[PDB]
Design a protein around this ligand. Structure first.
Ligand SMILES: [Mg+2]
Ligand SMILES: [Mg+2]
Lengths: 240, 240
Protein backbone atom coordinates (compact mmCIF):
# COMPACT_ATOMS: atom_id res chain seq x y z
CA UNK A 1 0.00 0.00 0.00
CA UNK A 2 1.53 3.27 -1.22
CA UNK A 3 -0.28 6.31 0.19
CA UNK A 4 2.50 8.69 -0.88
CA UNK A 5 3.17 7.90 -4.55
CA UNK A 6 6.39 9.96 -4.73
CA UNK A 7 7.94 8.84 -1.47
CA UNK A 8 6.63 9.29 2.06
CA UNK A 9 8.33 12.01 4.14
CA UNK A 10 11.71 11.44 5.80
CA UNK A 11 12.76 13.13 9.03
CA UNK A 12 10.05 11.72 11.26
CA UNK A 13 10.89 10.96 14.90
CA UNK A 14 9.88 7.33 14.50
CA UNK A 15 11.90 5.08 12.19
CA UNK A 16 8.92 2.89 11.35
CA UNK A 17 5.57 4.13 10.08
CA UNK A 18 2.11 2.57 10.34
CA UNK A 19 0.71 1.66 6.92
CA UNK A 20 -3.03 1.16 6.50
CA UNK A 21 -5.47 1.53 3.64
CA UNK A 22 -6.85 4.67 5.27
CA UNK A 23 -3.42 6.27 5.61
CA UNK A 24 0.26 5.95 6.46
CA UNK A 25 1.36 7.61 9.68
CA UNK A 26 4.58 8.38 11.54
CA UNK A 27 4.05 8.65 15.29
CA UNK A 28 5.94 10.79 17.79
CA UNK A 29 6.12 9.03 21.16
CA UNK A 30 7.22 12.28 22.81
CA UNK A 31 4.41 14.61 21.70
CA UNK A 32 1.92 11.69 21.54
CA UNK A 33 0.73 12.87 18.12
CA UNK A 34 1.69 11.90 14.55
CA UNK A 35 4.53 13.84 12.89
CA UNK A 36 2.79 13.40 9.56
CA UNK A 37 -0.10 11.50 8.02
CA UNK A 38 -0.22 10.72 4.31
CA UNK A 39 -3.39 9.58 2.57
CA UNK A 40 -4.71 8.83 -0.90
CA UNK A 41 -8.20 9.91 -1.89
CA UNK A 42 -9.79 8.16 -4.87
CA UNK A 43 -13.33 8.02 -6.20
CA UNK A 44 -14.01 4.96 -4.03
CA UNK A 45 -12.70 6.23 -0.68
CA UNK A 46 -15.18 8.91 0.42
CA UNK A 47 -18.16 7.85 2.53
CA UNK A 48 -20.57 9.80 4.72
CA UNK A 49 -22.65 8.96 7.78
CA UNK A 50 -19.93 7.01 9.58
CA UNK A 51 -19.77 7.24 13.38
CA UNK A 52 -16.92 8.44 15.57
CA UNK A 53 -15.90 5.78 18.09
CA UNK A 54 -12.60 7.12 19.46
CA UNK A 55 -10.08 4.38 20.31
CA UNK A 56 -6.46 3.99 21.32
CA UNK A 57 -4.37 2.91 18.33
CA UNK A 58 -3.82 -0.83 18.91
CA UNK A 59 -0.67 -0.82 16.78
CA UNK A 60 1.22 1.50 19.13
CA UNK A 61 2.53 1.18 22.66
CA UNK A 62 -0.21 2.69 24.89
CA UNK A 63 2.42 4.88 26.55
CA UNK A 64 3.43 6.50 23.23
CA UNK A 65 -0.05 7.66 22.25
CA UNK A 66 -3.24 9.01 23.86
CA UNK A 67 -6.35 7.13 25.04
CA UNK A 68 -9.96 8.39 24.88
CA UNK A 69 -9.85 9.09 28.62
CA UNK A 70 -7.04 11.60 28.08
CA UNK A 71 -9.41 14.06 26.38
CA UNK A 72 -11.72 14.42 29.39
CA UNK A 73 -12.49 18.08 30.00
CA UNK A 74 -10.30 19.13 27.07
CA UNK A 75 -13.07 21.09 25.33
CA UNK A 76 -14.13 23.13 28.36
CA UNK A 77 -10.54 23.95 29.31
CA UNK A 78 -8.83 24.62 25.97
CA UNK A 79 -11.76 24.91 23.57
CA UNK A 80 -10.30 22.12 21.44
CA UNK A 81 -11.98 19.32 19.48
CA UNK A 82 -10.70 15.84 18.71
CA UNK A 83 -9.44 16.88 15.28
CA UNK A 84 -8.76 14.35 12.54
CA UNK A 85 -5.50 14.63 10.59
CA UNK A 86 -6.58 12.26 7.80
CA UNK A 87 -10.24 13.28 7.17
CA UNK A 88 -13.00 10.81 8.05
CA UNK A 89 -15.51 11.62 5.29
CA UNK A 90 -12.92 11.60 2.49
CA UNK A 91 -11.61 8.15 3.37
CA UNK A 92 -14.32 6.34 5.37
CA UNK A 93 -14.90 4.04 2.40
CA UNK A 94 -11.71 2.04 2.92
CA UNK A 95 -11.71 -1.41 4.54
CA UNK A 96 -9.97 -0.29 7.74
CA UNK A 97 -11.89 3.00 7.98
CA UNK A 98 -12.27 2.58 11.75
CA UNK A 99 -8.58 3.46 12.12
CA UNK A 100 -9.48 7.01 11.06
CA UNK A 101 -10.88 7.40 14.57
CA UNK A 102 -7.83 5.95 16.33
CA UNK A 103 -6.28 8.67 18.50
CA UNK A 104 -2.99 8.38 16.61
CA UNK A 105 -4.85 10.21 13.82
CA UNK A 106 -6.19 12.83 16.24
CA UNK A 107 -4.81 15.91 18.01
CA UNK A 108 -6.34 18.61 20.26
CA UNK A 109 -7.32 21.06 17.50
CA UNK A 110 -9.02 24.38 18.33
CA UNK A 111 -12.73 24.07 17.57
CA UNK A 112 -12.76 27.25 15.49
CA UNK A 113 -10.06 25.84 13.22
CA UNK A 114 -11.44 22.27 13.09
CA UNK A 115 -14.95 23.47 12.21
CA UNK A 116 -13.71 26.47 10.25
CA UNK A 117 -11.06 26.98 7.57
CA UNK A 118 -9.72 23.45 8.12
CA UNK A 119 -13.11 21.87 7.38
CA UNK A 120 -13.64 24.05 4.32
CA UNK A 121 -10.25 22.98 2.93
CA UNK A 122 -11.13 19.33 3.56
CA UNK A 123 -14.38 19.94 1.68
CA UNK A 124 -12.62 21.39 -1.37
CA UNK A 125 -9.91 18.73 -1.16
CA UNK A 126 -12.59 16.02 -1.28
CA UNK A 127 -14.43 17.82 -4.10
CA UNK A 128 -11.37 17.58 -6.36
CA UNK A 129 -11.97 13.85 -6.74
CA UNK A 130 -15.37 14.60 -8.29
CA UNK A 131 -13.63 16.05 -11.35
CA UNK A 132 -13.58 13.68 -14.32
CA UNK A 133 -9.88 14.25 -15.07
CA UNK A 134 -8.75 13.84 -11.45
CA UNK A 135 -8.25 10.22 -10.40
CA UNK A 136 -6.20 10.69 -7.24
CA UNK A 137 -5.51 13.21 -4.52
CA UNK A 138 -2.34 12.56 -2.52
CA UNK A 139 -2.10 14.52 0.70
CA UNK A 140 0.40 14.82 3.53
CA UNK A 141 -0.64 16.67 6.67
CA UNK A 142 0.81 17.19 10.12
CA UNK A 143 1.31 19.59 13.06
CA UNK A 144 3.86 22.26 13.99
CA UNK A 145 5.20 22.71 17.54
CA UNK A 146 6.47 26.28 17.80
CA UNK A 147 4.88 27.55 21.00
CA UNK A 148 3.41 26.30 24.27
CA UNK A 149 -0.32 25.66 23.88
CA UNK A 150 -0.84 24.35 27.39
CA UNK A 151 -1.76 20.81 28.41
CA UNK A 152 -4.79 18.51 28.34
CA UNK A 153 -6.40 18.62 31.81
CA UNK A 154 -7.42 14.97 31.90
CA UNK A 155 -4.07 13.23 31.55
CA UNK A 156 -0.73 12.86 33.31
CA UNK A 157 0.99 11.68 30.12
CA UNK A 158 3.67 14.04 28.82
CA UNK A 159 2.43 15.50 25.53
CA UNK A 160 2.73 18.59 23.35
CA UNK A 161 -0.28 20.27 21.79
CA UNK A 162 0.40 21.53 18.22
CA UNK A 163 0.51 25.27 17.52
CA UNK A 164 -0.34 24.93 13.83
CA UNK A 165 -1.28 22.44 11.10
CA UNK A 166 -0.15 22.14 7.49
CA UNK A 167 -1.36 20.25 4.44
CA UNK A 168 0.48 19.45 1.20
CA UNK A 169 -1.61 18.28 -1.74
CA UNK A 170 -1.10 17.16 -5.33
CA UNK A 171 -3.34 15.44 -7.85
CA UNK A 172 -3.04 12.32 -9.98
CA UNK A 173 0.58 11.25 -10.52
CA UNK A 174 3.24 13.55 -9.12
CA UNK A 175 3.94 17.21 -8.34
CA UNK A 176 6.66 16.88 -10.98
CA UNK A 177 3.94 17.18 -13.63
CA UNK A 178 0.64 17.84 -11.77
CA UNK A 179 -0.90 20.74 -9.86
CA UNK A 180 -0.04 20.93 -6.16
CA UNK A 181 -0.75 23.06 -3.11
CA UNK A 182 0.38 23.68 0.45
CA UNK A 183 -1.40 25.38 3.34
CA UNK A 184 -0.44 26.33 6.89
CA UNK A 185 -2.97 27.25 9.61
CA UNK A 186 -2.30 28.56 13.11
CA UNK A 187 -4.33 26.95 15.91
CA UNK A 188 -5.93 30.33 16.56
CA UNK A 189 -7.24 30.86 13.02
CA UNK A 190 -10.61 32.69 13.16
CA UNK A 191 -13.74 30.59 12.59
CA UNK A 192 -14.74 32.48 9.45
CA UNK A 193 -11.28 32.68 7.89
CA UNK A 194 -10.90 32.01 4.15
CA UNK A 195 -8.59 29.01 3.78
CA UNK A 196 -7.22 30.52 0.57
CA UNK A 197 -5.31 33.12 2.56
CA UNK A 198 -3.05 30.49 4.12
CA UNK A 199 -1.30 29.18 1.03
CA UNK A 200 2.44 28.59 1.57
CA UNK A 201 5.31 26.73 -0.09
CA UNK A 202 6.34 23.15 0.65
CA UNK A 203 9.78 24.54 1.45
CA UNK A 204 8.38 26.62 4.32
CA UNK A 205 6.74 23.54 5.82
CA UNK A 206 9.91 21.45 5.57
CA UNK A 207 11.91 24.22 7.25
CA UNK A 208 9.46 24.45 10.16
CA UNK A 209 9.02 20.69 10.66
CA UNK A 210 12.42 19.20 9.86
CA UNK A 211 10.86 16.78 7.37
CA UNK A 212 11.44 16.26 3.67
CA UNK A 213 8.15 15.83 1.83
CA UNK A 214 7.92 14.04 -1.54
CA UNK A 215 11.27 12.49 -0.58
CA UNK A 216 11.42 10.29 -3.68
CA UNK A 217 11.44 13.12 -6.22
CA UNK A 218 14.61 13.85 -8.23
CA UNK A 219 16.79 16.53 -6.60
CA UNK A 220 16.26 19.10 -9.38
CA UNK A 221 12.47 18.77 -9.21
CA UNK A 222 12.52 19.22 -5.43
CA UNK A 223 14.73 22.30 -5.61
CA UNK A 224 12.68 24.08 -8.26
CA UNK A 225 9.12 23.23 -7.21
CA UNK A 226 9.20 23.23 -3.40
CA UNK A 227 9.89 26.96 -3.16
CA UNK A 228 7.08 27.85 -5.57
CA UNK A 229 3.42 28.03 -4.45
CA UNK A 230 1.28 25.75 -6.60
CA UNK A 231 -1.80 26.55 -8.69
CA UNK A 232 -4.01 23.73 -7.39
CA UNK A 233 -5.86 26.15 -5.03
CA UNK A 234 -7.28 27.90 -8.11
CA UNK A 235 -9.22 24.71 -8.85
CA UNK A 236 -10.47 24.87 -5.26
CA UNK A 237 -12.02 28.32 -5.62
CA UNK A 238 -9.06 30.49 -4.60
CA UNK A 239 -7.94 33.57 -6.55
CA UNK A 240 -4.52 35.06 -7.32
CA UNK B 1 -4.00 15.18 -36.46
CA UNK B 2 -4.48 16.95 -33.12
CA UNK B 3 -1.76 19.47 -32.29
CA UNK B 4 -3.84 21.21 -29.62
CA UNK B 5 -5.14 18.45 -27.32
CA UNK B 6 -7.60 20.73 -25.49
CA UNK B 7 -8.99 22.62 -28.46
CA UNK B 8 -7.14 24.87 -30.89
CA UNK B 9 -7.62 28.63 -30.42
CA UNK B 10 -10.78 30.36 -31.62
CA UNK B 11 -10.86 33.95 -32.84
CA UNK B 12 -8.44 33.56 -35.73
CA UNK B 13 -9.12 35.62 -38.87
CA UNK B 14 -9.42 32.51 -41.06
CA UNK B 15 -12.29 30.05 -40.61
CA UNK B 16 -10.00 27.32 -41.91
CA UNK B 17 -6.69 26.29 -40.38
CA UNK B 18 -3.91 24.34 -42.09
CA UNK B 19 -3.23 21.03 -40.36
CA UNK B 20 0.13 19.30 -40.71
CA UNK B 21 2.21 16.88 -38.67
CA UNK B 22 4.62 19.74 -38.02
CA UNK B 23 1.91 22.10 -36.77
CA UNK B 24 -1.58 23.52 -37.16
CA UNK B 25 -1.72 27.11 -38.35
CA UNK B 26 -4.32 29.83 -38.83
CA UNK B 27 -3.25 32.38 -41.42
CA UNK B 28 -4.10 36.06 -41.61
CA UNK B 29 -4.42 37.19 -45.22
CA UNK B 30 -4.22 40.85 -44.17
CA UNK B 31 -1.01 40.88 -42.11
CA UNK B 32 0.42 38.01 -44.22
CA UNK B 33 1.51 36.18 -41.06
CA UNK B 34 -0.13 33.43 -39.01
CA UNK B 35 -2.49 34.43 -36.18
CA UNK B 36 -1.36 31.41 -34.19
CA UNK B 37 0.66 28.27 -34.66
CA UNK B 38 0.03 25.22 -32.51
CA UNK B 39 2.50 22.37 -32.29
CA UNK B 40 3.05 19.14 -30.39
CA UNK B 41 6.55 18.14 -29.33
CA UNK B 42 7.22 14.49 -28.51
CA UNK B 43 10.42 12.49 -28.04
CA UNK B 44 10.20 11.58 -31.73
CA UNK B 45 9.90 15.08 -33.24
CA UNK B 46 13.21 16.81 -32.46
CA UNK B 47 15.98 16.61 -35.06
CA UNK B 48 19.20 18.53 -35.71
CA UNK B 49 21.08 19.57 -38.84
CA UNK B 50 18.14 20.22 -41.15
CA UNK B 51 18.55 22.75 -43.94
CA UNK B 52 16.45 25.90 -44.35
CA UNK B 53 14.97 26.20 -47.83
CA UNK B 54 12.57 29.11 -47.45
CA UNK B 55 9.43 28.62 -49.54
CA UNK B 56 6.01 30.09 -50.26
CA UNK B 57 3.37 27.92 -48.57
CA UNK B 58 1.75 25.93 -51.41
CA UNK B 59 -1.42 25.45 -49.35
CA UNK B 60 -2.25 29.16 -49.40
CA UNK B 61 -3.16 31.68 -52.08
CA UNK B 62 0.10 33.48 -53.03
CA UNK B 63 -1.56 36.85 -52.39
CA UNK B 64 -2.35 36.00 -48.75
CA UNK B 65 1.17 35.05 -47.70
CA UNK B 66 4.78 36.08 -48.37
CA UNK B 67 7.33 34.66 -50.83
CA UNK B 68 11.12 34.36 -50.29
CA UNK B 69 11.72 37.36 -52.56
CA UNK B 70 9.75 39.58 -50.13
CA UNK B 71 12.52 39.38 -47.51
CA UNK B 72 15.19 40.92 -49.75
CA UNK B 73 17.04 43.66 -47.87
CA UNK B 74 15.02 43.07 -44.70
CA UNK B 75 17.96 42.29 -42.41
CA UNK B 76 19.97 45.34 -43.47
CA UNK B 77 17.02 47.72 -43.12
CA UNK B 78 15.14 46.46 -40.05
CA UNK B 79 17.65 44.08 -38.47
CA UNK B 80 15.13 41.24 -38.62
CA UNK B 81 15.62 37.52 -39.31
CA UNK B 82 13.31 35.01 -40.92
CA UNK B 83 11.93 33.93 -37.55
CA UNK B 84 10.21 30.57 -37.14
CA UNK B 85 6.97 30.47 -35.15
CA UNK B 86 6.98 26.67 -34.77
CA UNK B 87 10.66 25.80 -34.03
CA UNK B 88 12.58 23.85 -36.67
CA UNK B 89 14.87 21.88 -34.35
CA UNK B 90 12.03 20.75 -32.06
CA UNK B 91 9.86 19.35 -34.85
CA UNK B 92 12.13 18.63 -37.83
CA UNK B 93 11.61 14.92 -37.20
CA UNK B 94 8.04 14.83 -38.53
CA UNK B 95 7.27 13.61 -42.06
CA UNK B 96 6.39 17.04 -43.48
CA UNK B 97 9.21 18.88 -41.72
CA UNK B 98 9.97 21.01 -44.81
CA UNK B 99 6.76 22.93 -44.07
CA UNK B 100 8.50 24.39 -41.01
CA UNK B 101 10.36 26.55 -43.52
CA UNK B 102 7.28 27.64 -45.47
CA UNK B 103 6.93 31.40 -45.03
CA UNK B 104 3.52 30.99 -43.38
CA UNK B 105 5.51 29.78 -40.35
CA UNK B 106 7.88 32.75 -40.53
CA UNK B 107 7.69 36.46 -39.65
CA UNK B 108 10.21 39.35 -39.67
CA UNK B 109 11.55 38.84 -36.15
CA UNK B 110 14.25 41.10 -34.68
CA UNK B 111 17.59 39.27 -34.72
CA UNK B 112 18.25 40.08 -31.07
CA UNK B 113 14.99 38.44 -30.04
CA UNK B 114 15.21 35.52 -32.50
CA UNK B 115 18.77 34.70 -31.45
CA UNK B 116 18.32 35.80 -27.85
CA UNK B 117 15.59 35.17 -25.29
CA UNK B 118 13.33 33.54 -27.88
CA UNK B 119 15.99 30.95 -28.77
CA UNK B 120 16.73 30.32 -25.10
CA UNK B 121 13.04 29.63 -24.42
CA UNK B 122 12.93 27.31 -27.43
CA UNK B 123 15.88 25.39 -25.94
CA UNK B 124 14.24 24.93 -22.54
CA UNK B 125 10.93 24.07 -24.22
CA UNK B 126 12.70 21.35 -26.20
CA UNK B 127 14.64 20.06 -23.19
CA UNK B 128 11.38 19.42 -21.30
CA UNK B 129 10.81 16.44 -23.60
CA UNK B 130 14.03 14.88 -22.30
CA UNK B 131 12.42 14.34 -18.90
CA UNK B 132 11.29 10.76 -18.29
CA UNK B 133 7.86 11.77 -16.99
CA UNK B 134 7.15 14.26 -19.78
CA UNK B 135 5.79 12.68 -22.95
CA UNK B 136 4.30 15.73 -24.65
CA UNK B 137 4.72 19.48 -24.89
CA UNK B 138 1.80 21.33 -26.44
CA UNK B 139 2.52 24.86 -27.51
CA UNK B 140 0.58 27.68 -29.14
CA UNK B 141 2.52 30.72 -30.31
CA UNK B 142 1.74 33.84 -32.32
CA UNK B 143 2.42 37.55 -32.91
CA UNK B 144 0.94 40.75 -31.50
CA UNK B 145 0.27 43.90 -33.55
CA UNK B 146 0.26 46.87 -31.21
CA UNK B 147 2.60 49.41 -32.80
CA UNK B 148 3.93 50.35 -36.24
CA UNK B 149 7.18 48.49 -36.90
CA UNK B 150 7.79 49.69 -40.44
CA UNK B 151 7.59 47.64 -43.64
CA UNK B 152 9.74 45.09 -45.47
CA UNK B 153 11.76 47.05 -48.09
CA UNK B 154 11.63 44.30 -50.70
CA UNK B 155 7.88 43.87 -51.23
CA UNK B 156 4.85 45.74 -52.58
CA UNK B 157 2.52 43.43 -50.66
CA UNK B 158 0.42 44.95 -47.89
CA UNK B 159 1.65 43.42 -44.61
CA UNK B 160 1.98 44.19 -40.92
CA UNK B 161 5.18 43.38 -39.04
CA UNK B 162 4.54 42.00 -35.52
CA UNK B 163 5.48 44.13 -32.51
CA UNK B 164 5.61 41.21 -30.07
CA UNK B 165 5.39 37.43 -29.73
CA UNK B 166 3.74 35.14 -27.20
CA UNK B 167 3.97 31.45 -26.38
CA UNK B 168 1.65 29.34 -24.23
CA UNK B 169 2.89 25.92 -23.11
CA UNK B 170 1.67 22.95 -21.11
CA UNK B 171 2.93 19.40 -20.69
CA UNK B 172 1.45 15.95 -21.13
CA UNK B 173 -2.36 15.99 -21.06
CA UNK B 174 -4.04 19.28 -20.19
CA UNK B 175 -3.38 22.50 -18.26
CA UNK B 176 -6.37 21.38 -16.19
CA UNK B 177 -4.08 18.91 -14.38
CA UNK B 178 -0.58 19.63 -15.78
CA UNK B 179 1.98 22.42 -15.38
CA UNK B 180 1.70 25.28 -17.87
CA UNK B 181 3.38 28.55 -18.79
CA UNK B 182 2.90 31.66 -20.91
CA UNK B 183 5.48 34.17 -22.09
CA UNK B 184 5.31 37.42 -24.06
CA UNK B 185 8.31 39.14 -25.68
CA UNK B 186 8.41 42.55 -27.36
CA UNK B 187 10.30 42.69 -30.67
CA UNK B 188 12.83 45.02 -29.05
CA UNK B 189 13.85 42.59 -26.30
CA UNK B 190 17.61 42.94 -25.63
CA UNK B 191 19.80 40.09 -26.87
CA UNK B 192 20.96 39.09 -23.38
CA UNK B 193 17.51 39.13 -21.79
CA UNK B 194 16.53 36.34 -19.36
CA UNK B 195 13.35 34.77 -20.78
CA UNK B 196 12.24 34.07 -17.21
CA UNK B 197 11.44 37.77 -16.82
CA UNK B 198 8.71 37.63 -19.46
CA UNK B 199 6.22 35.28 -17.83
CA UNK B 200 2.61 36.45 -18.20
CA UNK B 201 -0.90 35.01 -17.82
CA UNK B 202 -2.86 33.36 -20.62
CA UNK B 203 -5.61 35.91 -19.99
CA UNK B 204 -3.34 38.83 -20.84
CA UNK B 205 -2.44 37.19 -24.16
CA UNK B 206 -6.12 36.59 -24.96
CA UNK B 207 -7.01 40.20 -24.17
CA UNK B 208 -4.26 41.51 -26.46
CA UNK B 209 -4.84 39.09 -29.36
CA UNK B 210 -8.61 38.57 -29.43
CA UNK B 211 -8.09 34.81 -29.35
CA UNK B 212 -9.29 32.19 -26.90
CA UNK B 213 -6.52 29.67 -26.15
CA UNK B 214 -7.32 26.11 -25.01
CA UNK B 215 -10.86 26.75 -26.26
CA UNK B 216 -12.08 23.23 -25.49
CA UNK B 217 -11.52 23.39 -21.73
CA UNK B 218 -14.52 23.46 -19.35
CA UNK B 219 -15.57 27.01 -18.41
CA UNK B 220 -14.59 26.77 -14.74
CA UNK B 221 -11.09 25.55 -15.65
CA UNK B 222 -10.61 28.42 -18.09
CA UNK B 223 -11.78 31.10 -15.68
CA UNK B 224 -9.65 29.63 -12.90
CA UNK B 225 -6.28 29.04 -14.55
CA UNK B 226 -6.03 31.61 -17.34
CA UNK B 227 -5.48 34.37 -14.79
CA UNK B 228 -2.87 32.45 -12.79
CA UNK B 229 0.74 32.33 -14.00
CA UNK B 230 1.89 28.72 -14.21
CA UNK B 231 4.81 26.97 -12.55
CA UNK B 232 6.19 25.17 -15.60
CA UNK B 233 8.97 27.79 -15.98
CA UNK B 234 10.41 26.53 -12.67
CA UNK B 235 11.19 23.27 -14.47
CA UNK B 236 12.88 25.38 -17.15
CA UNK B 237 15.38 26.98 -14.79
CA UNK B 238 13.43 30.03 -13.63
CA UNK B 239 13.32 31.12 -9.99
CA UNK B 240 10.38 32.62 -8.09
MG1 LIG C 1 -11.75 17.79 11.65
MG1 LIG D 1 14.00 31.41 -34.34
Amino acid sequence: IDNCAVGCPTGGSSNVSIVRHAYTLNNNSTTKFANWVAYHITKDTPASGKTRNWKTDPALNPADTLAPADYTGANAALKVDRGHQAPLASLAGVSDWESLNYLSNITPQKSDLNQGAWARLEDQERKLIDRADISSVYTVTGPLYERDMGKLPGTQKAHTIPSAYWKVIFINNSPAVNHYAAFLFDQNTPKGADFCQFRVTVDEIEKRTGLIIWAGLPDDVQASLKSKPGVLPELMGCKN
